[PDB]
Amino acid sequence: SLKDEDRIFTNLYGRHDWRLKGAQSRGDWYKTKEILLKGPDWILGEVKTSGLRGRGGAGFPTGLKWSFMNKPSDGRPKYLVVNADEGEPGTCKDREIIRHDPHKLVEGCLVGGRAMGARAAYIYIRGEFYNEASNLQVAIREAYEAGLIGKNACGSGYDFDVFVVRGAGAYICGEETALIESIEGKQGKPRLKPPFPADVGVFGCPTTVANVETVAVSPTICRRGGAWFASFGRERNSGTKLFNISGHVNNPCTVEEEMSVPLKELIEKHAGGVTGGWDNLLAVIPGGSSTPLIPKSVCETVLMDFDALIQAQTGLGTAAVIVMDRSTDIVKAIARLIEFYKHESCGQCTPCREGVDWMNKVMARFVRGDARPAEIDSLWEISKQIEGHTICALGDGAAWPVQGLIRHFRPELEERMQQFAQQHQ
Amino acid sequence: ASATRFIQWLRNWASGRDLQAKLQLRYQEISKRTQPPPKLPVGPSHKLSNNYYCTR
Ligand SMILES: Cc1cc2nc3c(=O)[nH]c(=O)nc-3n(C[C@H](O)[C@H](O)[C@H](O)COP(=O)(O)O)c2cc1C
Ligand code: SF4
């Protein structure tokens, strides 16, 4: 019932030595000829039966999401979009899954090629990653020259070629409409999701946006057994998600741990700073930056799962650990995260461009402590107003963590406010 | 005669008691320039949180 320690049979293995010829020796592209020969009903049906959750910072299940982009009849040719850009600060899945083992992500494009019915595949990498982009292109150069992608792919009629497209230092490549608009040529602003979803219009084509970690699970489900990825973890949340332990820790390391693992044991397996949850003031974030900060009272009992964490009023989506020490300031740290959202908000929705930017200016006062005690109670209502009324989910991501400053905290905020007001006046 | 001492006896004698509360009656307790600058208090609004017009 409980989550297994690390798991000996893991999906991700490339970390020590792999280039191009080493991928065949490790265990990649083994059943590529058999997977391409199999129909779309067998490929998408296996993914639906396994029940693999969304690896990206959304929380939406993949099994239903891939089904919309099946396309029975369409005029415009279908495309495949793989968003490999780095998400929230803390999540370092992009730097590990692309630079070390690039062929694992390339196998997902071929496996998801015949399944979705894609004519051309796009791999979108962030502008900050240039050393990772050089390794990704060289692996694609070795793949195309060998004769496995393009024209005739593993003895099949479907011809799909992967092309790397570099961004330019933008966080607004997160949303499904945002990454589509960035590759389209226009400014990096997300289109309205309710009328035209991903399957309706993306670069003038019915497409599907997927994370690099989510794309890496597709050859693991196809080549190896479907029950192997389904059994490990919880009943609702399935699939081994790479959770990176970062922040105030003695040894920060990204580990490929199984789903529904306890947070007290997760810090112990990667070796934390002061303690797992005793010595240091526990204000560790269950997500990258989007999720609200978890208190010391509810941390050891709570499990790091895709569904179970949301029930404890801290929805982990980005799948990253950000631990905070007793010596480090809690208020000053999250105020920088809001300042991060100030720089990285696109500027469409007025509750975000004039909301989050206004939220940062109020939060800057809270660090110095020149605010009224009534201002804490007000700010909780503004954060509620931002969360519900936005185009993209960055408005959500800048609303959840500031609500975490109101819940479980507030004696920390009042003591900073009362002492600074008495000293100045 | 214009002396107040003798006159006050006459006005008290001729129908009803007088003396106090004069016709002019603007001698003492008449504050000029009102007061030092005051601060006007705010109602059930002004203080933030739960001040929606949906409720009001
Ligand atoms: C603040 C925020 C940032 C995100 N950043 C990324 C990202 O960098 N890359 C990505 O693939 N998905 C990101 N996502 C998830 C998106 O919603 C994505 O378009 C899609 O849902 C991923 O689908 P999948 O989980 O089925 O792969 C982000 C979500 C949020 C709320
Ligand atoms: S929520 Fe903010 S970042 Fe997202 S589309 Fe609206 S204005 Fe742009």
Kindly give, in sequence order, each residue whose CB lies less than 8 Å from that of residue A139, ignoring residues fewer than 6 positions away.
A20, A102, A103, A106
Report the DSSP beta bridge partners of residue A121. Answer: A80, A162
Nearest to A187 by CA among A162, A201, A168, A200: A168
Interface test with B, best of A365, A372, A375, A381 (most B CBs within 10 A): A381
**How far is the C-alpha of A171 from the C-alpha of A191, rounded, in Å?**
15
Contact (CB, 8 A) for A109 and A336 = no
**How far is the C-alpha of A316 from the C-alpha of A298, rounded, in Å?**
14
Q: CB of A190 closer than 6 A to ligand 1? A: no
Q: CB of A60 closer than 6 A to ligand 1? A: yes
**How far is the C-alpha of A260 from the C-alpha of A319, rounded, in Å?**
11
Nearest to A241 by CA among A349, A75, A397, A87: A87
Residue B48 C-alpha, separation from nearest chain A C-alpha, in angstroms: 6
Q: Do B48 and A374 touch (CB under 8 A)?
A: yes
Residue A221, SS3?
A: helix
Please list every residue in chain A whose beta carbon sits closer than 8 Å to the beta carbon of residue B49. 374, 377-378, 380-381
**How far is the C-alpha of A234 from the C-alpha of A323, rounded, in Å?**
24
Residue B51 C-alpha, separation from nearest chain A C-alpha, in angstroms: 9
Nearest to A388 by CA among A379, A377, A400: A400
C-alpha distances (whole Å) from A75 to each of A71, A119, A205, A206 are 10, 13, 9, 10
Task: State which amino acid sits at residue A346.
Answer: C
Bin A335: left if φ > 0, else alpha if -120 < ψ < 50, else beta.
alpha
Ligand 2 centroid distance, CA of A324 (Å): 28
Instruction: Spell out where A188-249 has E strands.
Output: 207-211, 243-247
Residue with the smallest CA separation from ligand 2 atom 6 is: A349
* ∠ CA A386-A391-A393, rounded to 5°: 65
Ligand 1 centroid distance, CA of A83 (Å): 8
> Residue A54, exposed/middle/buried by CB under 10 A (0-12, 13-18, 19+)?
buried
> Both tokens of residue A177?
């409409």
Residue A214, SS3?
A: helix
Report the DSSP beta bridge partners of residue A166. Answer: A125
What is the sign of the dihedral through the CA atoms of A232, A237, A238 and A240? negative
> Both tokens of residue A216?
């890496």
**How far is the C-alpha of A28 from the C-alpha of A32, rounded, in Å?**
9
Give, for A254, the enclosing helix (H) or strand (E).
strand A253-255
Contact (CB, 8 A) for A212 and A228 = no
Packing angle of the helix pair A103-116, A131-146 (nearest 10 deg): 60
**How far is the C-alpha of B56 from the C-alpha of B53, rounded, in Å?**
5
For a pocket test of ligand 2, which of A176, A343, A344, A348 has the largest count of ligand atoms closer than 8 A to its C-beta? A348
Packing angle of the helix pair A356-368, A411-424 (nearest 10 deg): 60
Residue with the smallest CA separation from ligand 2 atom 4 is: A392
**How far is the C-alpha of B38 from the C-alpha of A270, rounded, in Å?**
64
**How far is the C-alpha of A319 from the C-alpha of A408, rounded, in Å?**
22
Contact (CB, 8 A) for A292 and A336 = no
**How far is the C-alpha of A24 from the C-alpha of A148, rounded, in Å?**
13
- Which one-letter DSSP state was computed for residue A393? T
Contact (CB, 8 A) for A286 and A243 = no
Q: Is residue A187 annotated as involved in ligand binding?
A: yes
Packing angle of the helix pair A40-50, A212-223 (nearest 10 deg): 110
Task: Compute the residue count for chain B.
Answer: 56
Please list every residue in chain B whose beta carbon sits closer than 8 Å to the beta carbon of residue A377. 48-49
Kindly give, in sequence order, each residue whose CB lies less than 8 Å from that of residue A421, ignoring residues fewer than 6 positions away.
A369, A370
Nearest to A190 by CA among A164, A168, A171, A213: A171
Q: Is residue A180 annotated as involved in ligand binding?
A: yes
Q: Do B48 and A377 touch (CB under 8 A)?
A: yes
Nearest to A322 by CA among A359, A363, A290: A290
Nearest to A294 by CA among A247, A361, A238, A254: A247
Would you list the DSSP string of A293-328?
PPPSSSSSSSEE-TTHHHHTT----S-EEEE--SSS
Contact (CB, 8 A) for A24 and A12 = no
**What is the DSSP pairing of strand A253-255 with strand A261-262?**
unpaired
Helix, strand, coil percentages, rounded to 5, for chain B = 20, 0, 80
Ligand 1 centroid distance, CA of A233 (Å): 22
* ∠ CA A262-A265-A270, rounded to 5°: 125
Question: Quick one: closest CA in B to A380, which residue?
Answer: B49
* ∠ CA A377-A379-A380, rounded to 5°: 70
Q: Do A375 and B48 touch (CB under 8 A)?
A: yes
Experimental method: cryo-EM
Looking at the CA of A129, name the nearest ligand: 1
Nearest to A69 by CA among A178, A201, A180, A174: A201
Task: Compute the residue count for chain A.
Answer: 425
Ligand 2 centroid distance, CA of B6 (Å): 91
Contact (CB, 8 A) for A212 and A93 = yes
Q: Is residue A171 annotated as involved in ligand binding?
A: yes
Nearest to A356 by CA among A403, A388, A398: A398
Contact (CB, 8 A) for A237 and A306 = yes
- Which one-letter DSSP state was computed for residue A5? S
C-alpha distances (whole Å) from B15 to each of A162, B10, B23 are 117, 10, 16
Instruction: Name the resolution in angstroms.
Output: 4.1
Q: CB of A55 closer than 6 A to ligand 1? A: yes
Give, for A344, the enclosing helix (H) or strand (E).
helix A330-344
Report the DSSP beta bridge partners of residue A79. Answer: A120, A207
Classified by CATH at the fold level, domain A20-231 comes out as Rossmann fold (3.40.50)
How many C-beta atoms surround the C-beta of residue B40 within 10 A?
4
> Both tokens of residue A37?
């020969």
Contact (CB, 8 A) for A245 and A266 = yes
Kindly give, in sequence order, each residue whose CB lies less than 8 Å from that of residue A40, ignoring residues fewer than 6 positions away.
A70, A114, A115, A116, A117
Contact (CB, 8 A) for A106 and A153 = no
Residue with the smallest CA separation from ligand 1 atom 4 is: A174
Nearest to A237 by CA among A176, A289, A309, A320: A309
Nearest to A258 by CA among A285, A230, A227: A230
Task: State which amino acid sits at residue A108.
Answer: G
Q: CB of A177 closer than 6 A to ligand 1? A: no
Q: CB of A83 closer than 6 A to ligand 1? A: yes
**How far is the C-alpha of A225 from the C-alpha of A232, rounded, in Å?**
12
Report the DSSP beta bridge partners of residue A303. Answer: A262
> Both tokens of residue A283?
């204000």
Q: CB of A190 closer than 6 A to ligand 2? A: yes
**How far is the C-alpha of B13 from the C-alpha of B34, rounded, in Å?**
38
Interface test with B, best of A358, A375, A378 (most B CBs within 10 A): A378
**How far is the C-alpha of A400 from the C-alpha of B8, rounded, in Å?**
83
Half-sphere exposure of A318 (CA within 13 A, CB side): 28
Q: CB of A394 closer than 6 A to ligand 2? A: yes
Q: CB of A351 closer than 6 A to ligand 2? A: no
Give, for A353, the enclosing helix (H) or strand (E).
helix A350-353
- Which one-letter DSSP state was computed for residue A359? H
Nearest to A81 by CA among A214, A224, A189: A214
Ligand 2 centroid distance, CA of A394 (Å): 6
Please list every residue in chain A whose beta carbon sits closer than 8 Å to the beta carbon of residue B48. 374-375, 377-378
Kindly give, in sequence order, each residue whose CB lies less than 8 Å from that of residue A225, ignoring residues fewer than 6 positions away.
none
Please list every residue in chain A whose beta carbon sits closer than 8 Å to the beta carbon of residue B47. 374
* Secondary structure of A123-167 as H, E, C letters: EEECCCCCHHHHHHHHHHHHHHHHCCCCCCCCCCCCCCCEEEEEC
